[PDB]
Coordinates of C-alpha atoms and ligand atoms in Angstrom, one line a residue:
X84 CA 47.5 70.4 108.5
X85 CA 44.9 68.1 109.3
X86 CA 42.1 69.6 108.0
X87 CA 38.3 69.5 108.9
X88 CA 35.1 70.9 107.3
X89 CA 33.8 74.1 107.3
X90 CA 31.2 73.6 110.4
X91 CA 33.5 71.1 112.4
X92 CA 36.7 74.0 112.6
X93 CA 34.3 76.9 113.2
X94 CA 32.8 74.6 115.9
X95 CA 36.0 74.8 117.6
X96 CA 36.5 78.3 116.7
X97 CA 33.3 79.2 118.4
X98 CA 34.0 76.7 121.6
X99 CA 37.6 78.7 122.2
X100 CA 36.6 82.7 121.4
X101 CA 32.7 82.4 122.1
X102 CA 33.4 86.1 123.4
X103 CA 35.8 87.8 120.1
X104 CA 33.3 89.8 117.5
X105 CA 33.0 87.5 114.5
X106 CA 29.9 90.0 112.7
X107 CA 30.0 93.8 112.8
X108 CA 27.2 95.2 110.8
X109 CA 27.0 98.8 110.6
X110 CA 27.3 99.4 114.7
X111 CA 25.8 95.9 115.3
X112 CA 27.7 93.5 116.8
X113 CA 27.9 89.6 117.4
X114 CA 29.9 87.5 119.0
X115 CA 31.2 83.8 118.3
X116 CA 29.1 82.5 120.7
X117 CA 26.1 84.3 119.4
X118 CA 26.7 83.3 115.7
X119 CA 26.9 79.7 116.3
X120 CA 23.4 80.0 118.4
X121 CA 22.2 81.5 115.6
X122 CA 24.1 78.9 112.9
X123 CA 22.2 76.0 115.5
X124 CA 18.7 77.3 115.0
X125 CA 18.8 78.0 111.3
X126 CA 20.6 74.5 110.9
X127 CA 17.6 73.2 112.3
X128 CA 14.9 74.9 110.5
X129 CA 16.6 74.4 107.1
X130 CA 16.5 70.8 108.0
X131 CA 13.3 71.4 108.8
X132 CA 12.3 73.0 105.6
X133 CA 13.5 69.5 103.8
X134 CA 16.9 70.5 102.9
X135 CA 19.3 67.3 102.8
X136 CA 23.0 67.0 102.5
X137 CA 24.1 67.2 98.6
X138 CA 21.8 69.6 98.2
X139 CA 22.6 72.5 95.6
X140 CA 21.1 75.5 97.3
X141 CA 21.9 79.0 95.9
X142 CA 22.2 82.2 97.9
X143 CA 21.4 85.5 97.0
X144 CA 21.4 87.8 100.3
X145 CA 22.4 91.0 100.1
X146 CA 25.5 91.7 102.8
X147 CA 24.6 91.5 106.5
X148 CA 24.8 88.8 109.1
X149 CA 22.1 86.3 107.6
X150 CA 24.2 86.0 104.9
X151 CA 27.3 84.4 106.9
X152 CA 24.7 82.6 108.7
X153 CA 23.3 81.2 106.3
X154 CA 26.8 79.7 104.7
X155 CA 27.6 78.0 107.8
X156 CA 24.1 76.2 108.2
X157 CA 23.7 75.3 105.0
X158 CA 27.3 73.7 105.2
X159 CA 26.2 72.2 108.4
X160 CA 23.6 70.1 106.6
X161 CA 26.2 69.3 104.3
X162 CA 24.4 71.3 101.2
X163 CA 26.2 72.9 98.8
X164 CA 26.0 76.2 98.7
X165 CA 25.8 78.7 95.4
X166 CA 26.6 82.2 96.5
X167 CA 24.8 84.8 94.1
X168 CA 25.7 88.5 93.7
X169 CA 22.1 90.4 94.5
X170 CA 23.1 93.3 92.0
X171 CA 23.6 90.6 89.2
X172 CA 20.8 91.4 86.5
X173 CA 18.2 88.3 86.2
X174 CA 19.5 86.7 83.4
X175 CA 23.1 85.9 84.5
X176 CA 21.0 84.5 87.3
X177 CA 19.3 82.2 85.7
X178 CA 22.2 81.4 83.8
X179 CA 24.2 80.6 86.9
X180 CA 21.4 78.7 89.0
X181 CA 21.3 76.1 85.9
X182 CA 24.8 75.9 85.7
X183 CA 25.5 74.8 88.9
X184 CA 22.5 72.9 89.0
X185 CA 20.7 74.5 91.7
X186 CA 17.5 72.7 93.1
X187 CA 16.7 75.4 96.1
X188 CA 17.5 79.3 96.0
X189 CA 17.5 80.7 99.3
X190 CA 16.8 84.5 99.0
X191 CA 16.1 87.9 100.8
X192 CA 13.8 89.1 97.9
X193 CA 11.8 86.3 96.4
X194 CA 10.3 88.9 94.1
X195 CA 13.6 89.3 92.7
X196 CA 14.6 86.0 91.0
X197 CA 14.5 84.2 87.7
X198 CA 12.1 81.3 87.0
X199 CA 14.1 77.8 86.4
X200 CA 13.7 74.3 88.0
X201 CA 14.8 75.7 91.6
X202 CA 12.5 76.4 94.4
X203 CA 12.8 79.6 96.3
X204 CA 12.7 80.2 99.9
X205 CA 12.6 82.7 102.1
X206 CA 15.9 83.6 104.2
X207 CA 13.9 85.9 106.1
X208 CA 10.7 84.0 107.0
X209 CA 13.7 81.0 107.5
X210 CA 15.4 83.4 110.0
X211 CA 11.9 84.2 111.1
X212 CA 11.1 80.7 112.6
X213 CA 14.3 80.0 114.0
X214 CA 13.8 78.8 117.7
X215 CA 16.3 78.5 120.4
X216 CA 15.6 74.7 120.4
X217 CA 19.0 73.0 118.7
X218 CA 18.7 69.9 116.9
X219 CA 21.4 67.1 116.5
X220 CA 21.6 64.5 113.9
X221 CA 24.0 66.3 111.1
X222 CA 25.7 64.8 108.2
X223 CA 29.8 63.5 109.0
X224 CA 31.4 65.7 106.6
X225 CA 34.9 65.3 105.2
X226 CA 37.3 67.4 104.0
X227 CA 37.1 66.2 100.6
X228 CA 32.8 66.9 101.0
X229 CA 31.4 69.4 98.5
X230 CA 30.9 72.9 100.1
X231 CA 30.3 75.9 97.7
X232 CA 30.1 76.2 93.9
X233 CA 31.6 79.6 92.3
X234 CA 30.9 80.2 88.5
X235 CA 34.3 80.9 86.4
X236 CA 33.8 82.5 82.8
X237 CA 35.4 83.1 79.4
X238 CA 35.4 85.9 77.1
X239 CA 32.1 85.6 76.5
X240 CA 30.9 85.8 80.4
X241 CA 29.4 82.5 79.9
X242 CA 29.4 80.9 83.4
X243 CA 30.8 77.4 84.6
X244 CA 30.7 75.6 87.7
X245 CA 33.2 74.7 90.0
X246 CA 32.7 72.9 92.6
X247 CA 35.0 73.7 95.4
X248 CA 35.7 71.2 98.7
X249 CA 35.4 72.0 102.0
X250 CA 39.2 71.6 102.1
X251 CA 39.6 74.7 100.2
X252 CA 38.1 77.5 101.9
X253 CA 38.3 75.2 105.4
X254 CA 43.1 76.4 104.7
X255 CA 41.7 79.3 105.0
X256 CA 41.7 78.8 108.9
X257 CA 45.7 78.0 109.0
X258 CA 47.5 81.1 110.0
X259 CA 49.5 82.6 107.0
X260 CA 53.3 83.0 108.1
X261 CA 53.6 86.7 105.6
X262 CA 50.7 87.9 106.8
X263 CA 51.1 87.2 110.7
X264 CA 47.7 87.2 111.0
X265 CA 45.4 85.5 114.1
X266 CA 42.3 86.1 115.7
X267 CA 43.4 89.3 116.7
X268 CA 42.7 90.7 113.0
X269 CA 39.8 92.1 111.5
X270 CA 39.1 91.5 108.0
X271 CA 36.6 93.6 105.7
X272 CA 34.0 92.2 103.6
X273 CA 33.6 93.6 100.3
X274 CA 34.4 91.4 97.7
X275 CA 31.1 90.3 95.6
X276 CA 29.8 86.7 97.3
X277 CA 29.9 85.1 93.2
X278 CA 34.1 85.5 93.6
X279 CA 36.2 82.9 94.8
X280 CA 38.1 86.7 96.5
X281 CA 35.1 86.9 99.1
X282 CA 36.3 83.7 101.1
X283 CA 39.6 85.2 102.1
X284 CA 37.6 87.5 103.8
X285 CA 35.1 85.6 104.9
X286 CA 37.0 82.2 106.1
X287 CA 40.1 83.6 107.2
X288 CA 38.4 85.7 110.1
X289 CA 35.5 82.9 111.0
X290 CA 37.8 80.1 110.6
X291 CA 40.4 81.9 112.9
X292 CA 38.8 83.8 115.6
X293 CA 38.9 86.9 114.1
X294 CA 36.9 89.4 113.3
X295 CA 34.5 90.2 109.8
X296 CA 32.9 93.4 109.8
X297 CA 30.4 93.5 106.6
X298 CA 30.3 96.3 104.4
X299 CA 27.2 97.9 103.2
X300 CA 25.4 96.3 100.4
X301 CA 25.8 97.8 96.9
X302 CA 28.8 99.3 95.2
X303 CA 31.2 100.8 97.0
X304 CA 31.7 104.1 98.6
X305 CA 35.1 105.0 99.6
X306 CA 34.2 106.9 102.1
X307 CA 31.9 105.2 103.7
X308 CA 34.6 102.2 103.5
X309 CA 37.8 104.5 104.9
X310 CA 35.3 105.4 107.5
X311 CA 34.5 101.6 108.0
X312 CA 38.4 100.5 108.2
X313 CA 39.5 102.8 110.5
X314 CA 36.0 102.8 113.2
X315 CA 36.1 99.0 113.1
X316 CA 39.8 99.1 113.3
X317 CA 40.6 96.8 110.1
X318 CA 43.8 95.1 110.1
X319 CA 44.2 92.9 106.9
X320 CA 42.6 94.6 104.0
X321 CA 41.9 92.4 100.8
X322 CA 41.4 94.4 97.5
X323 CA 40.5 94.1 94.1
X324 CA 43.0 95.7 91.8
X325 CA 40.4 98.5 91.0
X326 CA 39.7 99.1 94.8
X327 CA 43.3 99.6 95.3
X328 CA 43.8 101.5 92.9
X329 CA 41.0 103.8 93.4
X330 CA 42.2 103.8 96.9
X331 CA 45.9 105.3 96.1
X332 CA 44.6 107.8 93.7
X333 CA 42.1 109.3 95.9
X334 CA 43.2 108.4 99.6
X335 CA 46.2 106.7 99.7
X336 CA 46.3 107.0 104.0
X337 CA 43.6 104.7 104.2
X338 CA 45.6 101.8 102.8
X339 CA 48.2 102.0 105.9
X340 CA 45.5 102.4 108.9
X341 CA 45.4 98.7 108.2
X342 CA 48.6 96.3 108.9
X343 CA 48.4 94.4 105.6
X344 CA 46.8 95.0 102.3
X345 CA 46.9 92.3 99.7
X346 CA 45.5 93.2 95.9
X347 CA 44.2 90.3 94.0
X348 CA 43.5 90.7 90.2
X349 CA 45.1 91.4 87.5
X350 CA 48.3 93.3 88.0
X351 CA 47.9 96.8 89.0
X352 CA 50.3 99.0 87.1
X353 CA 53.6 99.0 89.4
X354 CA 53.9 102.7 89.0
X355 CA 50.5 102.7 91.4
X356 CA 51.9 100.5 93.9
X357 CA 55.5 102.6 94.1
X358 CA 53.5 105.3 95.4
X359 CA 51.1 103.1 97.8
X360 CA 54.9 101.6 99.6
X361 CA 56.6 105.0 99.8
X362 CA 53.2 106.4 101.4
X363 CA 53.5 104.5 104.6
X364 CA 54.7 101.5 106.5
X365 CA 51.6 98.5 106.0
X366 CA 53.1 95.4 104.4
X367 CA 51.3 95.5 100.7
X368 CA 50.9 92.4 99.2
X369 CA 50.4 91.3 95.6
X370 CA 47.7 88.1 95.8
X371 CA 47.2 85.4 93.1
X372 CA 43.9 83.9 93.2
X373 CA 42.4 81.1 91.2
X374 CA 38.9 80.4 91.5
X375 CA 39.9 76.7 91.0
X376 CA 41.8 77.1 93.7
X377 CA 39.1 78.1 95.9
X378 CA 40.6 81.2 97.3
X379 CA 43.7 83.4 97.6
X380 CA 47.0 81.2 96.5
X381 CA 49.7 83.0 96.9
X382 CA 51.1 86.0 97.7
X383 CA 54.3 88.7 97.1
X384 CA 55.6 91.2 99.4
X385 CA 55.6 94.4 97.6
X386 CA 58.8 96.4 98.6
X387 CA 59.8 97.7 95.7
X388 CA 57.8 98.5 92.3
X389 CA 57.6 89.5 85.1
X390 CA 55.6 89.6 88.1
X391 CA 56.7 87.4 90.9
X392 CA 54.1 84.8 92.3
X393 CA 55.5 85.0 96.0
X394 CA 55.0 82.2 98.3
X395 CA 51.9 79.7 98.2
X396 CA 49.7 79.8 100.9
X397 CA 49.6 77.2 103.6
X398 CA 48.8 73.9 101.9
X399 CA 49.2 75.6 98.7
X400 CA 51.9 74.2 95.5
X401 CA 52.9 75.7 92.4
X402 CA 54.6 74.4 89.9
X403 CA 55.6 75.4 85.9
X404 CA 55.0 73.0 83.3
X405 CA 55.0 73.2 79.5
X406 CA 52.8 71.9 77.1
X407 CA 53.9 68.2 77.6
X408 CA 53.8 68.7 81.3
X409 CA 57.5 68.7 81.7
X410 CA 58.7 71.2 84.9
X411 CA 60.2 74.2 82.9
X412 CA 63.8 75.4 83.0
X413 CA 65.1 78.7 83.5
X414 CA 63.2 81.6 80.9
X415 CA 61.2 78.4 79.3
X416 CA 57.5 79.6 79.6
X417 CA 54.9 77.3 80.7
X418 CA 51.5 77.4 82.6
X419 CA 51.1 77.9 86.2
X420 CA 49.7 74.6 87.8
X421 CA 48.2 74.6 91.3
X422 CA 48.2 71.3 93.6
X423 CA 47.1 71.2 97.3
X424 CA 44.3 72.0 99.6
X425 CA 42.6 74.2 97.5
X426 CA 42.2 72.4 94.3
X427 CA 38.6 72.3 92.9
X428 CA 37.0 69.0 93.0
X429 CA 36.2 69.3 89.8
X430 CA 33.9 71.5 87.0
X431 CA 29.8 69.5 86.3
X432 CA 31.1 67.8 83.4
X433 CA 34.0 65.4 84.1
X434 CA 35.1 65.2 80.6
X435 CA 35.9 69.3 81.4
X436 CA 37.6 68.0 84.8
X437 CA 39.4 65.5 83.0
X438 CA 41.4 68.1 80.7
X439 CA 42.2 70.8 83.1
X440 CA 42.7 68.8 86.6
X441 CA 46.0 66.7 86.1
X442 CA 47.8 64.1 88.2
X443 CA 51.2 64.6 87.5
X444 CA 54.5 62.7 89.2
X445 CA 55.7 66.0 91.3
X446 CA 58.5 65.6 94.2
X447 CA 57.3 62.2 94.8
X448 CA 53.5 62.4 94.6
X449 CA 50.7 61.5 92.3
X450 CA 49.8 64.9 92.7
X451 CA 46.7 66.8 91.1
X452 CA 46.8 70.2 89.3
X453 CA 44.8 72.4 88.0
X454 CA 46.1 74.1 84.5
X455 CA 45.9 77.5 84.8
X456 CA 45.4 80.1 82.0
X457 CA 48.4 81.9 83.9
X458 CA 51.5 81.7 81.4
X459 CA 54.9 81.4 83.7
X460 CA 58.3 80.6 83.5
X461 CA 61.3 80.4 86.4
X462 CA 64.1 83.3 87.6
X463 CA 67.3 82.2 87.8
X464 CA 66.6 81.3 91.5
X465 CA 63.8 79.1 90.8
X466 CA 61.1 81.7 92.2
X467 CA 57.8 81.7 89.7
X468 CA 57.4 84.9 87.9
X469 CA 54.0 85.7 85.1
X470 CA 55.3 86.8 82.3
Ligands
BR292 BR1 45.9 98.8 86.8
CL293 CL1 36.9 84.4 124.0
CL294 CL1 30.5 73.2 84.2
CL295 CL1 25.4 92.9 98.7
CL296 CL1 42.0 86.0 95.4
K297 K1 47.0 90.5 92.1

C-alpha cells in the first residue's frame, strides 16, 4: 500500500521477471528485461532531445510496442504524458493538445497532426537513435507526481483535462482480490489510448509481471481478436460495453477462453449478460470506471442477471452523499463520490478542481472526493447500487 511511481515499480517488476513476456505484437515478442533496455535508451535520447520533467508531451502512436515504450520513458523523465487516439480526426486533436496544454507531441506520422503551439517529434527517428548506452541522472518522482493527462467531455464532446497522478494508474500494480490475478495473466490491449479504460490493460500487466499482448491498430475485428485471445492465451479480458456485447451476440465462447471478463461502460442490458453467465464458467464482471479516477474503480461479480457497484478496487473508496454532502440513508439518492489512490489531481483550471474535488470528514479522514455524475443511493445492507 505503499505506493511508488510508474518507472520506480516497473523497475522492480523488470528486476524480478526480466524473463515473463510483457509485449506480444502480432507473433513478436519481448520480454521484461528487453522492454526496460529499450525504456533505458529511449529515456536517454528523449532526454537528449531536451525533454525535461513537467513536461506536457502528447502521444499519438498507433498500437505496437513503441507505444508502451514510449509511456514508460517519458514517465521516467518525469513528463507528462497525453495519450492521443491516431484515428481521432485533426480537429479533436487540436482541440485536445490545447486543452491539456501540450508543448511537445511525440508522433509515428508527423504528416498527420494539427498545427498549434506544440512541437512535433518523431517516435520513430527517436526509436531510431536509441543506443545501448544508458544514462543516469532521472527526476525523484513521487507518487503524488503528475503522470498522464486523459481528456473527459460533456454533451457537447468538448474536451477537458485531467491530470491524473502517478498514484493512480501506479494501484494498478496491487493484485485485485475478485479478480485473482498475478503475473501469470495476460491482459489484451484494445481499449482506445484517449480512455482512462486502456490503463487497466496496460498497468495492470506491466505493473505486475504479466503479460500485454497489443492488438492490431484500427477498429476492431472480432475475429481477428477471438483469434488473438485464445493464440496468446488471454486470461483477464477488459471490455467496453459494445465489445461485450458484440461478443455475446456473435460468439459468445470467446468470452470464457479467458478466466475473467470485466465490462466497463454504461450498463449493458442484463438480458445480454444472463446469456454470457449461463454460456460458460469465466467469472464476468461488471467494472465502474471514472476517468477522474484514473482507471477501473470497482467491480461486481455477475452471477445472476439498480445496478450494484461491487467492491472498490485496492486503494479505492466509495461513498453516497447528497446535495449537502451528508452520507445517504437507505433509498435516499445521492452522487457517487470516489476517494483514494486513484483520485485525479485535479482538472487545468483550479476554480473547476475546486467544485468537483471535495474534502469531506469520512470515517475519520479529511478525505478527498471526486463528485461523480453517477446518481446512487444504498440497499438495505449498505452495498452501493446506480440507480
Ligand atoms: Br446495452
Ligand atoms: Cl523471470
Ligand atoms: Cl480543464
Ligand atoms: Cl491504434
Ligand atoms: Cl474502466
Ligand atoms: K460497466
Amino acid at each position: 500500500y505503499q505506493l511508488k511511481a510508474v518507472p520506480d515499480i516497473f523497475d522492480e517488476i523488470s528486476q524480478r521477471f526480466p524473463d515473463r513476456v510483457a509485449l506480444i505484437f502480432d507473433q513478436r515478442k519481448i520480454t521484461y528485461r528487453e522492454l526496460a533496455e529499450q525504456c533505458s535508451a529511449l529515456a536517454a535520447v528523449l532526454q537528449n532531445n531536451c525533454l525535461i520533467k513537467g513536461d506536457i508531451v502528447a502521444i499519438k502512436i498507433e498500437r505496437s510496442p513503441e507505444l508502451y515504450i514510449f509511456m514508460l520513458a517519458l514517465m521516467k523523465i518525469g513528463a507528462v504524458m497525453v495519450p492521443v487516439n491516431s484515428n481521432s480526426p485533426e480537429r479533436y486533436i487540436g482541440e485536445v493538445l490545447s486543452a491539456a496544454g501540450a508543448r511537445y507531441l511525440i508522433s509515428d506520422d508527423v504528416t498527420s497532426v494539427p498545427g498549434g503551439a506544440w512541437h512535433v517529434l518523431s517516435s520513430r527517428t527517436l526509436i531510431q537513435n536509441c543506443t545501448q548506452q544508458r544514462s543516469g541522472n532521472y527526476p525523484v518522482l513521487s507518487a503524488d507526481d503528475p503522470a498522464l493527462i486523459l481528456m473527459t467531455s460533456g454533451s457537447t464532446g468538448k474536451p477537458k483535462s485531467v491530470l491524473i497522478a502517478h498514484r493512480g494508474i501506479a494501484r494498478l500494480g496491487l493484485p485485485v482480490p475478485a479478480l485473482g490475478n498475478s503475473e501469470r495473466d495476460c491482459y489484451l490491449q484494445i481499449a482506445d489510448i484517449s480512455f482512462a479504460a486502456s490503463a487497466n490493460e496496460i498497468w495492470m500487466a506491466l505493473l505486475t509481471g504479466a503479460c500485454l499482448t497489443i492488438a492490431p491498430p484500427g477498429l476492431p475485428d472480432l475475429m481477428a481478436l477471438a483469434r488473438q485471445i485464445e493464440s496468446d492465451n488471454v486470461t483477464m479480458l477488459f471490455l467496453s460495453g459494445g465489445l461485450f456485447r458484440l461478443f455475446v451476440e456473435v460468439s459468445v465462447e470467446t468470452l470464457h477462453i479467458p478466466d475473467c471478463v470485466v465490462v466497463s461502460g454504461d450498463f449493458v442490458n442484463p438480458r445480454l449478460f444472463s446469456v454470457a453467465v449461463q454460456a460458460g464458467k469465466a467469472k464476468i464482471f461488471n467494472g465502474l470506471g471514472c476517468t477522474e479516477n484514473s482507471a477501473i474503480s470497482s467491480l461486481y461479480h455477475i452471477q445472476s442477471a439498480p445496478v450494484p457497484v461491487g467492491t472498490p478496487l485496492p486503494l479505492v473508496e466509495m461513498v453516497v452523499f447528497n446535495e449537502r454532502l451528508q452520507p445517504c440513508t437507505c433509498g435516499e439518492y445521492g452522487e457517487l463520490f470516489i476517494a483514494g489512490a486513484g483520485v485525479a489531481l485535479g482538472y487545468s483550471d483550479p476554480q473547476l478542481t475546486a467544485e468537483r474535488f471535495i474534502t469531506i470528514p469520512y470515517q475519520g479522514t479529511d478525505m478527498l472526493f471526486y463528485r461523480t455524475d453517477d446518481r446512487a443511493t444504498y440497499d438495505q445492507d449498505r452495498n452501493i447500487v446506480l440507480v
